[PDB]
Structures are given as structure tokens and as C-alpha cells.
Amino acid sequence: WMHHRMLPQDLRERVRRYDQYKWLETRGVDEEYLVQNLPKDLRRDIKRHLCLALVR
Amino acid sequence: KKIFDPQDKFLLYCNKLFVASCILSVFVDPFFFYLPVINAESKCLGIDRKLAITASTLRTFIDVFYLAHMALQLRTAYIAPSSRVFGRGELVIDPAQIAKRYLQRWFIIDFLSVLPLPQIVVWRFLQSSNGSDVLATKQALLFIVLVQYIPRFLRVLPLTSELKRTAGVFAETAWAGAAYYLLLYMLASHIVGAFWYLLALERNDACWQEACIDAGNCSTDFLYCGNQNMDGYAVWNRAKESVLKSKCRADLDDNNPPFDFGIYTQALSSGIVSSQNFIVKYCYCLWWGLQNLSTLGQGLETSTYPMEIIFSISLAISGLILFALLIGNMQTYLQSLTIRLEEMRVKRRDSEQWMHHRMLPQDLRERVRRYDQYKWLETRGVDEEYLVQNLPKDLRRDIKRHLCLALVRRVPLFKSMDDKLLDAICMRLKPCLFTESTYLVREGDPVDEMLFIIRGRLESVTTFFNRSLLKEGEFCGEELLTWALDPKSGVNLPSSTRTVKALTEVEAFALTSEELKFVASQF
């Protein structure tokens, strides 16, 4: 895609750096699809452990 | 005490060496199996002496680099769960807990692998003058080396998982990846050829030690080198090469021998057990390993001796596993390389089936075929708007303005804007494609989009009727602008006054009517 559109060679490096950084943090795992397939009671207990001492 | 953070840069070059030193150490341990020799002119069994110095020097100088690894493993800190801090895990930089974690779970598969058991039985042999101890030295290397391969293979596991986290699971796939399973054949071949050499010398020993208990004038201490100055040896020396060749000779065609050597007759009939050049001896055995691991044992002709049979059964199973692991990875590599091209071929078979079922005229089939061919040459199956929508918002805005700003700065109503709404239209333009002789709009039809020409060349007529031309940079469909601009319009689309037709292949950018009123109601 970037060879076809003839992008400048400084937007190419920004795209490459975002993709490399996301691969090291997620390993391709989509976690919002994982969390929405759990039952409602346990989804609440996981989201309270992750995000409750940060919004207060 | 300079306690280390696991994502230090310093424990990254100091961990890419402890993986490459664990691969060099499983390649050095087969060299202890080449230590027994045969002195051919004197007919005695000995020990190669410049090999036992070198192969003991190299193992000791390598297994001291791995003493450094356990030193940097007590100055290291680990991550545990907590809900108090919010960075997904608290870092435990605390002595007498990091060390109490370590020496209960991975200290015994690390201490039991550096103990120099082969290095001391060479030192005792080279300080001795009893010539008949070359059998105890040769005996205490098969089991030592074979049982000290559990820790020296198993200890590569906790260090590859730490290279699985900093530079990722990734690594290249051309000149790596499928090159890794050809270099595993080469190490399995190297362990197998050295087992074969060592078991051939023990069958030759079993033959000799029983032609001496029938000749009457022999003791089993005269067969080993360095025992020529004993009484009774001057009688045995007179009749060595009549007994030892009427009873224990090796020949590849002799179908009725006094001793059966089995799979080992090729090593005693060629003379590599008495060979003086080490390159000849090494290369001959490594090619035996590679040739018998690739054909899965098919040329092997055993005897009725059971441990020889168990060695042969092991080769045919190891070769079955290695072959399947190589064919497995080469195919997953090749299937991932032609995925976009295999999708295009499935799409064309689906189109031919659908047009045969509905029984279409032959001039509509050719229009469908030409559009599909043109789109494959322009995109190669890549979906561009799915790619762009997965980038972060700041960089998406920088990519769309390199592509769509000089086009929208040619509409005169758009150059009268504040460069904030001028970057909200560049983020809803989407690409389009038109083959030759297609009609972009017909006169009297409801106008549904504006278009901006990138490539190609069109024509336009109005009511032979003062026809016109359009080329790159010009636009089309600005009756929708006057509709969406003022609220004197109603929710109904205007009608076209032109007929636009393509004379070559066109590329354009498009702007939907439901996206033009959302921009216009920012006034």
C-alpha cells in the first residue's frame, strides 16, 4: 500500500514504528472481544480490578 | 546492590550469548566418543591423546561463561499481582525474596549441568602407567555423556522465553525459520555418527577378548596398549596375526564370518578406526549419520544381537519425526506467501458459476470480467480503508492530507474555509475505479456523490449537444453542493444535467451526500 501511494519516507517510518510497538504489547490478541464473551458478573469483577483505583 | 530491571539493555546482549553458548556446548560433547583408537601395526587398543586434551579444554572454557548467568540471576527482580498500583503488577526489588524464589524452581536444572564429570576421567588416565585401564576410561564416557544431556538440553527453556518478550516471537522467515530445520538434521547426524563409531569399537573388543580365551597363550591384559613389558607377552607376540585374523577379520562380502559385526562392519573394513587423519574419520561418520537418518534405516543389515536392534529402531523413529517437522514448516511458510493470489482465484470461479447459473448475456459477462481484472491490477487484493482506520488519529490525518489536499483546493467554495473544515473533508474521501466506456452519471438521474479525478480522461455532454472534456484535477457533481449548502432543499436529491462517460480507465475520490450535509451544517 505505501509503495503504491508513493508515501514520503518519514510517514512510512511512523507506520512501521506503530505496528512494531503494538505487536510487542498485544501479540495479536484482541482483548475487548475476549472480555465481551464472558458472563456479566465476572466482566464487572475484572473491570473493577483494572480501572477502579484510577477513576477515583 | 545494583539490582537489575529485566528490561535493561544490559541483560539483552548478556542473554543473546547464553543462548549461543548453549548451542555450542551440545556440539562439543560428541567429540568424547572419538577417543578410543586401534594401533594397526602393533594390534593394540589405545586412546587418542591430543583429542582428549583439546575436547576437555574447550568444554571447561565454555562452561565458565554459564557461571556468570547464575550470578546475574540473584540480582534480578520479578513482577507480582496487586490492585494497589495501576501499572499491571508491582516490581519486587527486594533481597532474600528474589533469591528464595530462584533456588527452589530452576537451580537443579542449572547446577547439575556444569559438573565436570568427563574432564576428570581424562586427568586420571593421563597420570597413570597401568596400560590396562583404557577400558574403564572408555566405559565411563557413554553413560556420563548420555545422562548429562537431560540438564544441558533442558536448560535452554527458561532463557528462550526471555527472548520471547523483548524482540518478540518474531524473527525473519527468509534465510531463517525454514533454515532452522535444516540445521537440526546436521546436529542429529553428528550425534548419531559418533554413537556408531563408539559401538563399533565395543563389538571389536568383544571379538578380541574371546579369541584370547581360546588361544591358551593370552591374557586379556595383553590386548591393551602399553603392556608389552610383561612376562608371557613374548609368547603371545609370536602368534598375534594368525589368531586375530583367523577369528576376528572383517569383510563386506564374506557371507559366513566367524564373528558377525552387523551394522559395524563398514567401519572396521574401511579402516577409519586405525586412521591417522582426523578429517577423514570425522567426515566418513557424519555422512553415515546423514545418510541413515534421511532414508529411515533402509539399508541397515543387523545381526541377532538385541542392543544393535534397539539402536536401529531408534534411528527409524527419529528420522520419521525430523522429516515431518521439515515438511510442516515449509508449507506453512509457502501458504502464507500466496494468500492474496489464492483468494482472487476463488473469486473468479465463484463469478463463473454465478453467471452460468443465471444465464447472462455474453456482453455483461465481459464487463464483469474486465472490472475484476482492472481491480486486481490496481490493488493486489489489499483493503486500503481497513488499513487506514486502524492507525492512530494523528497519523491518519497526516496521511490523508498528503493525498487529498491539492484536489479539494480547486473547488472555489472550498478555498474559502478555515483549514479545520478543510481537513474534515479530506478524512471522508474514498477511492473509486472505472473501466472504459462506463457511464459515471446519466442525465435525469438523482445525483448521489461528488467526484475528483486523479487519473484518466472523460467526456461530458449537456442535453452533439456542446460536448466537453475533463481531465486530471477537475471535478464532477457540484449540483449536490448547492443542494446541501443552504437548508432550502428538502430531503430529496437533485437531478443531473450532464452525461459523463469514461474514455480511458479512471481513478477518483468520492464524497457521499450523507457526508456533505454533515460538513455543511458546521456553519
Place this chain on the structure above:
Amino acid sequence: KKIFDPQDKFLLYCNKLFVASCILSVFVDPFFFYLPVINAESKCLGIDRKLAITASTLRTFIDVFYLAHMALQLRTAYIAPSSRVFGRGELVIDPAQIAKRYLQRWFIIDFLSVLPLPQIVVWRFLQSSNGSDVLATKQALLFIVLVQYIPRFLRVLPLTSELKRTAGVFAETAWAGAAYYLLLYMLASHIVGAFWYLLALERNDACWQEACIDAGNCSTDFLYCGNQNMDGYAVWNRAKESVLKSKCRADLDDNNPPFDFGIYTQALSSGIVSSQNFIVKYCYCLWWGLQNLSTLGQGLETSTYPMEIIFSISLAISGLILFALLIGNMQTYLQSLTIRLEEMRVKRRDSEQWMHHRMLPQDLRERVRRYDQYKWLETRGVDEEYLVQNLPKDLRRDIKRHLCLALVRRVPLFKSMDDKLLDAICMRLKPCLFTESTYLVREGDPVDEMLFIIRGRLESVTTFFNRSLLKEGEFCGEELLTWALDPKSGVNLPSSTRTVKALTEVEAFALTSEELKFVASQF
């Protein structure tokens, strides 16, 4: 200067030959390896003379035909990024900039592949009169041909990438694609058999040059052809076939020979090194290549000479790679050809599990099985509305007017409507399928669609109660027309007055109620 535009039609017919001349030139370089012979009459070593004429004519008449390519490469422009474009790239037509680009990328390994190094050592040999030149000529062809082959293989890479851009990646998948990896076996076999011939003649030379330095009455200049008029040769001529037969004879069964020939004994014991017919000599060696690359060296019996062993290790590895590349590509071809049928089989296994879990009655299982079978026979797993929605808007309208116009022009309200508004109902009609004895609507149920019969035969009753018949072309469900037409309706659906039942298998087109009011409110 007629500077060329890279997608000219001429540079696409003048580049489909420079690819087929590079495939033809890597098949000609093995023919230099068939130049040494043995004269069986005189027992001397020579050079085949018509083969060295012919194989030097052909390489020179191809390297200069390739010499035209880089001149045309000196006249070609290139594309660079810019934001002043309207077309995604500025064309650079300055001749001061295209050549300075060219002599940094692919000029060094294009130049070192036309240099006639094998063509001059034939010319210097054929102008000479001392017969002891057949060793320097034979020595300066193994390394020259073997090292001047990294450019003649590397120079295909840019020209293939320039055919991966204008003609797609698809050539053909059944009459090609998997036929490409069988024609690679045939070229690898052809290089391997010619290496084997040449190394057999060097072992025969090594044997002869040492039965002459032990006989005492020989100099090594008498073994080469054309040195019969020298003093000392008349003494040697009297004892040729006593020394060269008691020391360097070849026999396939002699298990104790004076010289070991190893993998080369089959070429010296059959006599193809002294053969006069070239077809026999070529075919014998090419079949040795194909037979030993296919079974990966299983039948080879080497000697203890170390370069013979390295040559065998190379064959066992190259054959492992070629085989895996052939099973990989056949399986990706076959998996892509049955993709719709395997998906029907997976869908068939899921339904039995679901109906066994819920414990359905056995009359409801057969109704599900019949619908699945009928739909597989009618569609072959092809999704037709997803196909149609991906075509451009002008061609969608033509396909949908060919399929659905003579059905909507049998409704009396619709035939009087319009011509532009008839082309908006023939865009929302969607196909349907009904097995036998199913109820299309029941009396007293809310009507939700109109239907248009394509195939099949139905019946209809109203309140045994003046029953009726319907066939192809007729319609059903026009109580929704009176509902959606006037705004005297409310947002609620009417109730049916009929009961329609299928007597055979039906196909229809359907019109949803939420799509009928959107058409009706265009009045």
C-alpha cells in the same frame, strides 16, 4: 531522445524475451563440463572438438542479445514521491539523473555476467600444437563456470519484479504453477549429472598419474593425446596395457581394488567416458542426476576421499529442499479447489450435533436436511448478493434489469408507474427458496413480504373453500401494496386472507415491507 515510459507496450514485448533468454542460458553452461574424453584406442586423454565449437558459439550468440537490455535500461525514466502530483508520483526524465541512479543498483551484477571467460580458453586451446594443454584447459572450467554463475542467477530478480506489475501475478494455475516445480527437478538433474561426469574424469587422471611415477619408464606428458612423437615414448608404448590395466582398472563387483573410485566407478565401468555417440552419454548422466536427487543419495557408496563426501552431502540436502517445495505447492493448489465443498461438509456435521443435543423429533430433522440439500444443489455455496453489491453502480442496474423487469411488469399498478421508478424496485428484490409442502403464508398471520414466482407450482385457498392455483410469473402478497401505498395505514401490518402452499420446489424474489414504503413515499 525517445526516453522510454516504463509501461510502454514495446517494453513489455521486449522484456518477455529477456526472461526466456536467462532461462536458456543457465541450461547451456553445463555443456562445457562434457569436454574431456578418453581415447580408448591410444589410451590417452583428450578434448572433444566439435562440442567446444558448438557450446562456445551458442553462449556468445546469447550474451550479446542480452547486451541490448542495459542500453534500453539507459533510456528509461522512474517515479519518485511528491505532493504536487495529482497522480501519486513525479516522473523524472532527466538523463543526468536516470543513469546516476542506474549505476548504483544493478550495474555491477549485470556487467560481470556477459564477460566471455569460457570462450577464450577454448580459442587458446584450439590454436596450439603441444598436446599437454588438455590439463590447464580442463582445470580452468570448473571454477570459472562455478563462480560466474552467481550473476547469471541473480540477474533474473529485477526483470521478474517488472513482470509482477503489469501482467498480474496470475499466469495459470492448472496448466502451469505446479508444472513449474517439475521443470526445476529437470534442471537440477542436468547440473548434477554434469558435475558427476567431470569429477569422474579427475579421479581417473589421479590414478593414471601415479602408475606412471611408479613404473619408472613414464613421464606424465605421455598420457595426454598428441605427444606420441617424443623420445622415451616408444619405450612407454610397449607397456601401456600392462601397467594401466593392473593398476587402474574399474569393476563394479571387485571388493578389493588397487584404486578405489567410489561413486565414479559406474561411469568408468560402463564406458561412457570413451563413448562416441553423444546422445547415449547425455541420457546416461541425466538419469543418474534424476535418480540420485529423488531418493536423496540412498544408493551412493563413497570412498574415504573427503571431497567426494562433501559432494554427496550437498545432494542429500538439495533433494530434501526440492521435494518439500513440490508437496507444498500441490496441496495449496488442491485445498483452494475444494473450498466450497469442505464448508458444506463442516456445516452438515454441525447440524447433526445441534439436533442431537436438543433431542428434536424425527420429522423436524428431515425438514432441515431437505432444505440444506436443496440449497446446495441450487447455489453451490455461492453468496450472490455479496457478489452483486461489489460491482459498480451502472452494471448492477443492467444485471438487475435483465433479471427482474418482466416480473414487475405483470403487476397492474407497477406497469403504469414509471420507467425510472421501476428501476428502484428492481434493486431490492432478493432470492428465496422453498422445499415441497411448506406454507408460504397462513390465514390470519401478519403479511411481511411480496413474492414473485420464478419456478414451481403452488396452490391457494381462501377461508375446500374455492381453492386456486398459481404458477410461474404470478405474484403473491399484494395486501401489503394497499397498506404501504396510502398513508391511511398506521405502523402495523395487515392480516392475510389466503393460505399458500408449495406443491413442488419453488424459487422466488422477495420484497420486504420496510423497502416498499421507501418506494411508495417517492410520490
